[PDB]
Structures are given as structure tokens and as C-alpha cells.
Amino acid sequence: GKAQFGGQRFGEMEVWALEAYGAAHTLQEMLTLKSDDIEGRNAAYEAII
């Protein structure tokens, strides 16, 4: 919000569209790596650096 813009919604309709394709790893990282898994997101940030 005031500090940073904040993340964009991914809802369920977007999830339904994403898994309607064969994309499974994209959904896996966008539900855990880029959304919630704190150790996962920290490790991913360090690895990308």
C-alpha cells in the first residue's frame, strides 16, 4: 500500500486458466515460491542474485 504497491491478485479464475494449460510448475512457484513459502522465496531470491 503506502510503503510498497502490493502484490497483484491471482484469485481462482486465473488459477483455473493457468491449470487449464499444462503449466504445473508455474502454478507451483506462483502459489508457494512467489506467494507464501518464506524459506522458498528467500532462497529463490538469493539464488537469483
Partner: protein
């Protein structure tokens, strides 16, 4: 290290609760205001949940507490659920007995009931506290006696009703009155004198025949207690024997302590097998619960909870807001209240025992526990007075439209994402999108940091981050590095309403200057995105695995055709269509001279001279050829286009051009379009043969062209052709100059007199009403018919005028092509918008004579505002209804994934090719669109040869095959096509490749591992928002229509009797006759004496699916459901394939209930496939021929979705409470099959890339493979 495979949910024992928690909380003190540190052992204690200072604080996120209640309590879920699980395990009424026992002052008693109170032996009756408190201690009465007055009754006088104990004292019932000086004690007891030692002491309760005292001289006679008074040396025995006394949840516990499941199960079986279905219904209803406890382990003894768990503090934190004030979740308030009440109860029980106060406090504590567990089920506890907002309990956190399930199933927040307004991207290619450079730099920040660390921009990553934190340090080298980073990366663009699969699309970002996102025009229809201010979101996948996924199977260049049907979505849009129509149009003006040209060879010079003068125009309508074709002949298309560039001939001019092999009398515009197609693709012969250069390029022509190019060329060539078409359409629409003025809305003059004629007819009808010849309904129908006929006549006249006089009119040109507008809109602009619907649903009698070319009267505009408001409200609500339907379908169908070896299905469906009833009795060929939607992309069940061509069994039906079959059916060879269908597939969870079909975004057969269920649900639900719909709802959710049509269940003949009270239709057979009563409104469709079959609709109207299934069978009702669902979608012009509807219908009736029991109960319904496996195991695999005779049960979409083996999806779908309760009664080991469960757990999706068929695929290059194979063959010695 081991992978998660199953998720089990069950009840938790008090031992489990104590094992979870680390200590107990006793103080209701959250946190002191002055000392920000935790106050005491309460809800935030330091040593009970872990260190608050940086193990990290995450331990406090997971450590749980517990509260040891001094009084047992029962979970509100197991007592207030609609099937009361405690109330159905025991023989207690759910609604009133259970709660009056569980809250109020009522007593249930198992052990002793032989005592008599006017009622025979008591076993488990519910009796009020008053009558039990009486029969506990006999029948006691007390009478004070005034001092100084001696009553006439002594200490041992038996007293009956009416006896005067004194000059003013009289009793009321039989008993014994003991006298004192100073009172009278009336007891219902028997007194026995004795003079020897006592055998039974004071306090013991005795049974008849037992020795009381004095040896065998004195013995007990009735149940009761013995009291010995040595003042008169007498033993009194009351008629109240030792009987238990229990109240509250603790009492319930005792019941659950003494209940054994095996004996109850055997008794239920015995008392269910014998009687009729009336009792056996509830018998099996409770027997299933008993078996659920028995087979699942956990006993119901701990079904009520003794120790209440306490959530970790960070899950219910208290946060400073401003100026020291604390914002806290309602969880802390509920926990504080429960702790305070439990402490008060402990203190009260410790100090003293005032029974009524103790009981009130017990009720209060029970209510507090229930309110904590779930708020609203009994009363409405609220926050501090002044804010009437009910407290949020655990159930509110779990359930609701905004609950834990609907915030973790969705991943509501993403790191690498942004959003911005979208603008048109005409210079972009179809596989590209324009990304603003600032948001692109921000989104790719870690990649940019790594890239500039690779070079010498910054020493370390901290320096790079502080360089990029302030925009005044931006440099051209940073932009070059950013461009280098995103050379191969792709980003996912998304529109806020994601109706179907194409709402997410991958693109190759191109750095642009500005704030908006540049979007390719051709994807303006895949998304429902115009450029009137709407915004779109962008996401950046990180892993190379996800990058490959997005670039391969989500790139916009690879998705050109719909998943709902074969119609392309990357078709040329409005402006491109307009430009291509303008360039490929032929104009004709007038013929002024003798058109005869075929015969005279000297006429060429004469007509050339005539064209030199004004005798004949260049595009003259001659007999054989125009003078334009004679005057100009071009050796090559290049010469013709060069002559056009010199202004000699326009692109809309008829002319003879020598093409590669023939002389064509065409226009240079058509030749240029053909050349555009031929250069967009490589070869020119194929391009020439896949176009039709004899007609204007309407939108249907462009769609067919795109489909043919995709079929015969592939992916890249189709995309290049689309790009070329878009570019040239833009250029020629710009140079052609299409403009709309007020004079372009030409009003035909003939329509004028048309109105007059109608007006005259109107007047006639008016006088026809004043003579009494017509009724109000008849007059209204006549007026409506007249106006709706003259409206169509005016539309026809308008279009005829446009064709005849102004072929190049912008409105007419846009209407003919697929650019914009409809004939109704063009009529409203130029003709008249006559009929306007009333808010009541009918139509106004007075039409609107004027149009928008003219000026509407105030009344006409006020009338049209009605329709405007109706449309707005209808959109704003039907969108919500369609969304709910889509969610239902997705959740019910989400488990269908094509995982398969080709199933040995010797079954199929015969798709009809003729409409069975368009007139009362007639057969005609179905429409081409319906046949294509029913046959295209299917697999032939068996070989069929129809027109000298052998269509082999197992061959996918392409579009050409569908056309051939339609032509053959027109010729009259075949009427039904036997094809495979998902409805007959034998796959466990999903459908096989053959039984599914051939239609996809591509044309090739479906790949194994694709989640066809979700795309099917999306395809069905997407048109609903742009749509009737209640009919779709009542078909998908199997219901009983209000206008039910009577159907017959057995073959016979029809006997109609026209009794005025109610028509009687008789189905007459050889051995019996059935009778049906049809009211006056029952407008039937059968004739007397006609043969009638089972399931044939006797009357016209909707057919209830359940009775149809009972009558004909599963296949017939499946076909009826599919056809009825397709009917409404066809009526709205939506082209939707039948594969998705068949998937949903198969998932709708995948349940059967058995009639002849095997190893389970009879009247229970579950999966058809499980019963098939059980039958195969019972009959063949194992010994014992026990036929499990079942019948298929058809249930709605909601019921099918709710009743599933996996409890995670059911809990997350509709109702967490009931589903979780059912999955808690019996330990439900949720196998992680289905996509919703894996989304919940966040693991790899079983569909798509995660399918075990393709999940692991070892990849090695040539040299490593050669080395390891050399190792292999050297292991094979010699």
C-alpha cells in the same frame, strides 16, 4: 524427506490435545499496556509459546496452548449439525431433547429405572429435574407447627387424604406423619418396629427380600433407602431406590463411555433387515455413522472435548495501531472470556456448592465454549457494548466467502507482478507486448542486479541496489543491461475477469517509453479488453522450467483456435476486416448502351468509342464483359498494381489480368489481396488454392481462410499471415477513408408510406376494437404482430436501398462485413426502433416512429430508458449468476484429466444427423453447425463406408470428414454416426485419448495429461456472462421444472378421453393399462390411437430428468440433458462443442445406489466405478457370487461436487462445517488425486506437466549417451 501422499482428518483425543500443548493458560490477561512484554501465563505468555525476541519467533506461530476445563463440554459441530452426530449415535432427539439435556435442567438415566411413578420400568427416558428431584428422595412434605399447641397426630401415625392432623392441619395423600413437639414430616415410606441389632446401617439402599435388621425377622419389601430412628426404635423404608443423577455434557460423556459399537451395529442390522423401508431409512442413516466410528479407529468417547486447544499467538496477534491502542482479533476476546469463565467455575466449585448457582454457571460455561467454537449457532455473542458486530469464531475463519479455504486455494498475492492501462500495439508482432521500461526494470530487479554484477556497473549487489533505489542514477548502460536480461524471457498478461483459458497469455516483452502496456490488436478478442480505460496485469515467472512452459504452451502465437470449438480467436478484427473488405470490393454503376457484345466482333471499337464519350462507364454492366476488361489487360500483377499506382485504374475496377496460368476478370484489389496471402506464406500455389478471390472478404471468409491456413501450413506461417493481414488491413483502411456523417444514415423514402400504410391499418384495427369484434388480448396481439411485421419490412427496404443506391455506404459496408453493427442497429439508426419492452416484461402498444437520424420525442426517450435500465440490471446480476454456475461446474469437473492407456471400450454413442421433430411428424437434416459441433473431432466407433470411401474404425473426424458425412446424409445413405464419447469411457478418473477426441487449441489429437475437465467447465461457463440462463441452471442442477411434461414409462398405445374436468390419457398394453390425468393447461402433442413408447413426452413442456431416468435409462437421460443444454446455447448463437457438456454430464451421474446388498448396506449411494471394482473382485477375483445389484442415481451438480471421496475439495467448495464433520467422524485419508487438493497443498499438479506419464523423462545428449552406452556394452563382456 519423504513426500506427502495422504492427508488424514480425524477426532483428537484429550491425550492428543495435552500432547500438542506446552503448558496451560490460566489468566485472562493478554498483554499489559505499560509493559509491552507479555503480562502473565495468559494468551501470550513468553514461556508457554516461545521467545518473542529474535529460535526465531516462528515457534510462537506453531506452538499451541490448552485449557483444562473443570467441566466437560461437547463440540458445537457435533450437536448443532443438521444430522446431529451425537444425537444419531444415541437414541436422543436432535432438535429438543439433546439441547435441553445439554443446556437446561433435564436428566437422562441408563442404569436403574425399575422404580414406579405411574410409568413402567425406565431405561433411558428424558425427565425433568423436578420429578427426578422428587423420586430421588421419595415424597417429602413439611408442616410447621405453632408452639404451645399439641397436635392430635403422634410420631408414627399413618395418614390418608382428608385426615385432620390437628384442628386445622390436613394432609393430601397416603403416607406416614412424624410428629415433633416441632413440626410434621410427611413421608411416603413404610415403618417397621424392631428390638434387636441392625443388619443394614443408615445410608444403604435395599431391594426386596434382603435382610434389613433383626436377622430374618425383618426383610425389605420394596425398593428404597433404610433410615433407622432409635427414638422410637423403628426402621423406615422409602420408595426411592439408588438411581443415577447426571446432567450436562458430562452426562453425555457417560453415555459415550458405556456405548459399545459392535452390539449396536448388530442390533441395527437385525432391526433393519426385517421391517419395511420406513424404519430402515433411519436405521441405515444411523448405522452408517456407527460403522464410520467403528471402522475409523477413534472412539466417540472423546467426541466431546475435555481440554480446549489454544491457537498460536501470532495467528491471533494484538498490534499497536496508533497512540498505544491495540487492535486484536476476536479470537483473543473469546479466549479471554472462556478463561475467565473457567477460572470462575473452578473457584466456585472450590469454595462451596449452591446447586442453582452452580447449574447456571455450568450453562454459562457451556455457552461460552460453544460461542468460542462457533458463533451464531445459539444466540449472538457480541463485542463490548456500543459495537454490535458479532465476534469472529473459528468457523467464521474457516467458512465464508472470505475464509481460510478461499484465501489459500487462490494465492491471493504474488511478488513479481504489476498492472497498468493497456493501449493498442499495432507495430508489435503477435508474439510481442509493449512493457513500460520503469515497471520492466522494477519487475526484473534481481535479474538486472545479477546482470550488472556480471559487468562493471557495480562492485557488489548492495551497491547495485542503492544505485537503483533512486531514479536520478539511471544510466544508458542500465537500460542496455535490462534489454540484455529480457532477450528471451516472457511475461504473462492477464485480464481481471478470467472467463476462459485465454485470459492468461504469454508474451515477449519489448521495452517502450510511456506508462501504458502496448497490446497487440489481434488479441483484443481473446481477452474481453477494449481500450476505453481498462487495465491488465503482468506477471514474471522465474524458473527456467516455468519459462519453458510459458514460452511453449502459453505463448499467444501458439493459441490461435478456441478450446470451446474450432473457431479461431486470432481472426482479423474490425478494422482489418473493414480494410480488406474495402480493398476486395467490386463496384458497378450503370449500363447506358447496348450490352450485346458476345456476337459482334466490330462492337469492340464502337463500345470503346462509347466509353470515350459518356455513353458507358468503365464498370459497365455489359452482357458478357465490361469495357474495363476490354480496355486494360495486364501481363503480370505487378503491371496492374503499377498502373494503379499511377491513378489510371482504382483497386475497385474490373480488369483482365494474366495470372500465373489464367486470364482473370477481377479487380486489382483482389489480385493484391491474393499476392498478400501468397507473400505472407512461402509457397504461392497453396496460397492460391486456399483462398476465394471471387467474393468480397467478409469476416466469415477471413475466419475460414485462417482456419484453412492453420490446418494446411502450421503455427508460424499462420501467425505471419495474420500479421501481414493486420498490417495491410490497417494501411488500406487508413488510405481508403471510411467516415460516418449524418447524411450517411440515409432514410429510404418508401418506408415513409410504409408507416402511412401501417397507420391506416392501425386505424382500421382501432375501429375494429370499437365495434366489439376483438378482445383486449386479441387487439394487443394484432398490434404487436402488425408492428413487428412492418419493422422487418422497413429493415428489408433499408437494406435493399443500401444495396441498390449506395453500395459504398459506411454503415452498409460495416454491416455487410463483420466489422461492426447489426441490421437491427442499422435500422435503429436509419429506420425506426419501433417495439419497446415494458418493465413488466411485455411490450408497449405505441411504437417509436422516429430514429436517431431524426430526433426522438421526449416520451420515446423516456420509454427507451426503461430498456436501458433493464439491460444494465440484467447484466449486473446475470454476470453473478453465470459466475456461480461456472464455479459449480469447475469444482464438480476439476477431477477429470486424460490419463490413459487406450481403454477397451466396446461402447459408443450414435450421434443423430436428422431432427426427429420439426413438424408433428417429419424428419429433416440437422443444421450444419449442430452436426459440426456434434461430430467434428470425434473418433469413429466402427468402420463406416458411406460414399465409396472407407472411414476406418478409430479415425479422428476432421472438418472434411464432417462435410463428407453431411453431404452423404443429404444424399440419403446414413442417419446416425457411431462415435466414441466420454460418456462411455471406462477410465478411472478422467477420459482416455480416444474417448475424448480431437478438438483442441491445435487440431491434432489430445495430448495425454491435459486437464480437460477445467477447460470444459470454462468453455461452458464463459458464454453465460454474454447470454435462458435459468434453464441452464435447472438442467445442470437436476431439478423438477415447474411446467413438467407427463411422460410414459412403458410401451403401449394412446387412448385419449376428453372429459371436461381433466383429460385422461391411457397407455394401453396387452396385460395392463396406465392412466394419466392432464389439466386444462396441459397442452399435449399426441393423437389418439398412436403407439407410445417409454419416456415419450405425452404433453408439451419440460421433462423431469429423474423420472426420465427411472423410465428409459441412463443413456437416454444423458442424451436428453446434452441436447437440452445445447439448445439454449444454440438459440443465443454460441458455438459450443458437445465434449464439455458430455464431460459434465458424465461427472453428474457417476453415482449408483445398490439394491441387493453385498458386503455393505443397501440404500446407500456412491461411486459407480468403485461398485464395478467391488463386483469384479466379488464375482471373479474372489470366491462368492453375491450380485451387487445397483441402480444409477442422477443428482445435481452441487450434490455431486459435495459428495466426493476427497474431503479437501468438498470442504473448500461449498460448506466447510458439514463436510469437515463428516470427514472427522471417519478418518478420511484424502488421496492427493485431483487438482484442487494439490493446489491446496501447493504441490505439483497431477495434470499437465505433472502427469506421471510425462512427469519424469531422462534427457541426455549424444556424447554422454554414447559414453554410458559404451559402459553398458562393456558390462556385457565379450
Amino acid at each position: 524427506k519423504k513426500e506427502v501422499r495422504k492427508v488424514r482428518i480425524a477426532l483428537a483425543s484429550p491425550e492428543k490435545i495435552r500432547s500438542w500443548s506446552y503448558g496451560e493458560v490460566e489468566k485472562p490477561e493478554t498483554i499489559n499496556y505499560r509493559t509491552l512484554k507479555p503480562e502473565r501465563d495468559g494468551l501470550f505468555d513468553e514461556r508457554i509459546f516461545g521467545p518473542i525476541k529474535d529460535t526465531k519467533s516462528i515457534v510462537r506461530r506453531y506452538r499451541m496452548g490448552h485449557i483444562e476445563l473443570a467441566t466437560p463440554a461437547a463440540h458445537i459441530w457435533f450437536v448443532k449439525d443438521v444430522p446431529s452426530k451425537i444425537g444419531t449415535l444415541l437414541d436422543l432427539s436432535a432438535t429438543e431433547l439433546e439441547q435441553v439435556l445439554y443446556f437446561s435442567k433435564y436428566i437422562v438415566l441408563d442404569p436403574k429405572g425399575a422404580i414406579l411413578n405411574g410409568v413402567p420400568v425406565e431405561k433411558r427416558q428424558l425427565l425433568t429435574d423436578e420429578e427426578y428431584r422428587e423420586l430421588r428422595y421419595g415424597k417429602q412434605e413439611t408442616y410447621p407447627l405453632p408452639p404451645g399447641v399439641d397436635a392430635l397426630v403422634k410420631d408414627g401415625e399413618e395418614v390418608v387424604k382428608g385426615q385432620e392432623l390437628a384442628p386445622g392441619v390436613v394432609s393430601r395423600l397416603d403416607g406416614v406423619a412424624l410428629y415433633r413437639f416441632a413440626s410434621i414430616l410427611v413421608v411416603k415410606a413404610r415403618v417397621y418396629p424392631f428390638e434387636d441389632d441392625v443388619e443394614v446401617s443408615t445410608g444403604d439402599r435395599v431391594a426386596p427380600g434382603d435382610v434389613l435388621a433383626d436377622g430374618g425377622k425383618v426383610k425389605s419389601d420394596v425398593y428404597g433407602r433404610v433410615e433407622v430412628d432409635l427414638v422410637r426404635n423403628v426402621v423406615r423404608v422409602v420408595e426411592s431406590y439408588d438411581i443415577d443423577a447426571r446432567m450436562g455434557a458430562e452426562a453425555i460423556q457417560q453415555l459415550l463411555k458405556e456405548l459399545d459399537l459392535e452390539a449396536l451395529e448388530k442390533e441395527l442390522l437385525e432391526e433393519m433387515k426385517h421391517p419395511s423401508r420406513a424404519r430402515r431409512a433411519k436405521a441405515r442413516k444411523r448405522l452408517e455413522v456407527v460403522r464410520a466410528f467403528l471402522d475409523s479407529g477413534n472412539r466417540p468417547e472423546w467426541m466431546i472435548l475435555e481440554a480446549v486447544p489454544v491457537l498460536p499467538p501470532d495467528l491471533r496477534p494484538m498490534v499497536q495501531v496508533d497512540g498505544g491502542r491495540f487492535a486484536t482479533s476476536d479470537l483473543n476476546d473469546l479466549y479471554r472470556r472462556l478463561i475467565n469463565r473457567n477460572n470462575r467455575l473452578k473457584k466456585l466449585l472450590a469454595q462451596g456448592a449452591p446447586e442453582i448457582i452452580i447449574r447456571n454457571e455450568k450453562r454459562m460455561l457451556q455457552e461460552a465454549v460453544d460461542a468460542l467454537l462457533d458463533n451464531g449457532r445459539r444466540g449472538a455473542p457480541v463485542t463490548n457494548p456500543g459495537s454490535d458486530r458479532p465476534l469472529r469464531s473459528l468457523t467464521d475463519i474457516l467458512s465464508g466467502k472470505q475464509g481460510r479455504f478461499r484465501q489459500n486455494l487462490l494465492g491471493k498475492r504474488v511478488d513479481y507482478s504489476g498492472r497498468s492501462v493497456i493501449v493498442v500495439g499495432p507495430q508489435l508482432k503477435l508474439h510481442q507486448c509493449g512493457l513500460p521500461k520503469r515497471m520492466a526494470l522494477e519487475l526484473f530487479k534481481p535479474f538486472l542486479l545479477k546482470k550488472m554484477e556480471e559487468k562493471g556497473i557495480a562492485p557488489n549487489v548492495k551497491a547495485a541496489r542503492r544505485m537503483l533505489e533512486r531514479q536520478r542514477d539511471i544510466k544508458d548502460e542500465v537500460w542496455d543491461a535490462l534489454e540484455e536480461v529480457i532477450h528471451g524471457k516472457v511475461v504473462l498478461l492477464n485480464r481481471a475477469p478470467t472467463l476462459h483459458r485465454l485470459g492468461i497469455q504469454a508474451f515477449q516483452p519489448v521495452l517502450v517509453e510511456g506508462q501504458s502496456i502496448q497490446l497487440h490488436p489481434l488479441v483484443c478478442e481473446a481477452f474481453n479488453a477494449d481500450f476505453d480505460g481498462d487495465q491488465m496485469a503482468v506477471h514474471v515467472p522465474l524458473s527456467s522450467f516455468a519459462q519453458a512452459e510459458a514460452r511453449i504452451q502459453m505463448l499467444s502465437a501458439h493459441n490461435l483456435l478456441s478450446p470451446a470449438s474450432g473457431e479461431p480467436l486470432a481472426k482479423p478484427s474490425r478494422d482489418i476486416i473493414l480494410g480488406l473488405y474495402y480493398i476486395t470490393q467490386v463496384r458497378k454503376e450503370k449500363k447506358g448502351a447496348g450490352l450485346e457484345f458476345a456476337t459482334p466482333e466490330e462492337a469492340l471499337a464502337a463500345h470503346e468509342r462509347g466509353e470515350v464519350a459518356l455513353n458507358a462507364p468503365i464498370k459497365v454492366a455489359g452482357r458478357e464483359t465490361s469495357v474495363g476488361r476490354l480496355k486494360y489487360v495486364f501481363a503480370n500483377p505487378d503491371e496492374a498494381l503499377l498502373a494503379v499506382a499511377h491513378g489510371i485504374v482504382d483497386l475497385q475496377d474490373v480488369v483482365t489480368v494474366r495470372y500465373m496460368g489464367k486470364r482473370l476478370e477481377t479487380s486489382p484489389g483482389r489480385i493484391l489481396f491474393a499476392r498478400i496471402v501468397a507473400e505472407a506464406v512461402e509457397d504461392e500455389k497453396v496460397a492460391w488454392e486456399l483462398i476465394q478471390l471471387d467474393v468480397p472478404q467478409e469476416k466469415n471468409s477471413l475466419k475460414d481462410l485462417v482456419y484453412q491456413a492453420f490446418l494446411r501450413l502450421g503455427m508460424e506461417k499462420t501467425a505471419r499471415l495474420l500479421d501481414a493481414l493486420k498490417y495491410y488491413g490497417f494501411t488500406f483502411s487508413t488510405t481508403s477513408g471510411i467516415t460516418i456523417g449524418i447524411d450517411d444514415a440515409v432514410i429510404p423514402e418508401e418506408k415513409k408510406q410504409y408507416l402511412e400504410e401501417a397507420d391506416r391499418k392501425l386505424l382500421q384495427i382501432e375501429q375494429a376494437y370499437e365495434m366489439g369484434f376483438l378482445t383486449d388480448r386479441e387487439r394487443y396481439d394484432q398490434i404487436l404482430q402488425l408492428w413487428t411485421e412492418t419493422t422487418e419490412k422497413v429493415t428489408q427496404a433499408v437494406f435493399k436501398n443500401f444495396e441498390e443506391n449506395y453500395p459504398f455506404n459506411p454503415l452498409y459496408v460495416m454491416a455487410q462485413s463483420g466489422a461492426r453493427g447489426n441490421p437491427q442497429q442499422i435500422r435503429q439508426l436509419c429506420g425506426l426502433r419501433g417495439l419497446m419492452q415494458k418493465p413488466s416484461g411485455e411490450t408497449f402498444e405505441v411504437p417509436v416512429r422516429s430514429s436517431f437520424r431524426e430526433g426522438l420525442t421526449v416520451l420515446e426517450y423516456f420509454i427507451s430508458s426503461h430498456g436501458a435500465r433493464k439491460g444494465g440490471a440484467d447484466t449486473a446480476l446475470r454476470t453473478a449468476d453465470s459466475g456461480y454456475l461456472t464455479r459449480k461446474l469447475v469444482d464438480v469437473t476439476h477431477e477429470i484429466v486424460v490419463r490413459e492407456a487406450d481403454c477397451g471400450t466396446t461402447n459408443y454413442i450414435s450421434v443423430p444427423l436428422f431432427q426427429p421433430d420439426e413438424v408433428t411428424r417429419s424428419l429433416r437434416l440437422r443444421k450444419r453447425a449442430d452436426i459440426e459441433a456434434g461430430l467434428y473431432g470425434r473418433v469413429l466407433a466402427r468402420e463406416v463406408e458411406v460414399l465409396g470411401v472407407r472411414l476406418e474404425e478409430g479415425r479422428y473426424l476432421s472438418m472434411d470428414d464432417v462435410h463428407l458425412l453431411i453431404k452423404a446424409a443429404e444424399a440419403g445413405e446414413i442417419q446416425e454416426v457411431p462415435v466414441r464419447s466420454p460418456l462411455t469411457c471406462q477410465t478411472r478418473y478422467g477420459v482416455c485419448q480416444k474417448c475424448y477426441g480431437y478438438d483442441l487449441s491445435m487440431a491434432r489429437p489430445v495430448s495425454i495429461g491435459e486437464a480437460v475437465g477445467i477447460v470444459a467447465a470454462q468453455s461452458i461457463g464463459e458464454p453465460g456472462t454474454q447470454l435462458g440462463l435459468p434453464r441452464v441452471i435447472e438442467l445442470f442442477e437436476a431439478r423438477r421444472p415447474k411446467a413438467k411434461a407427463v411422460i410414459s414409462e412403458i410401451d403401449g398405445v394412446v387412448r385419449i378421453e376428453e372429459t371436461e374436468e381433466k383429460l385422461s390419457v391411457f397407455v394401453e398394453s396387452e396385460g395392463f393399462s396406465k392412466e394419466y390425468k392432464l389439466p386444462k393447461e396441459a397442452r399435449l402433442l399426441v393423437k389418439d390411437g398412436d403407439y407410445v413408447e417409454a419416456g415419450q413426452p405425452l404433453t408439451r413442456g419440460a421433462i423431469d430428468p429423474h423420472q426420465l431416468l427411472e423410465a428409459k435409462g441412463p443413456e437416454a437421460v444423458e442424451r436428453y440433458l446434452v441436447e437440452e443444454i445445447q439448445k439454449v446455447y444454440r438459440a443465443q448463437g454460441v458455438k459450443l462443442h458437445d465434449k464439455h457438456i458430455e464431460i459434465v454430464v458424465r461427472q453428474m451421474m457417476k453415482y449408483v445406489e445398490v439394491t441387493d446388498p453385498g458386503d455393505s448396506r443397501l440404500l446407500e449411494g456412491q461411486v459407480l466405478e468403485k461398485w464395478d471394482v467391488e463386483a469384479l473382485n466379488e464375482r471373479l477375483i474372489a470366491e462368492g457370487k453375491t450380485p451387487v445389484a445397483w441402480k444409477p442415481l442422477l443428482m445435481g451438480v452441487t450434490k455431486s461436487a459435495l459428495s466426493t471421496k476427497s474431503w479437501l475439495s468438498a470442504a473448500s467448495f461449498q460448506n466447510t462445517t458439514h463436510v469437515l464433520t463428516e470427514a472427522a467422524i471417519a478418518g478420511k485419508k484424502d488421496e492427493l488425486i485431483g487438482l484442487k487438493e494439490n493446489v491446496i497443498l501447493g504441490r505439483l499438479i497431477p495434470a499437465g506437466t505433472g502427469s506421471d506419464f510425462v512427469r519424469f523423462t531422462q534427457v541426455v545428449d549424444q556424447k554422454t549417451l554414447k559414453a554410458i552406452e559404451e559402459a553398458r556394452k562393456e558390462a556385457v563382456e565379450a
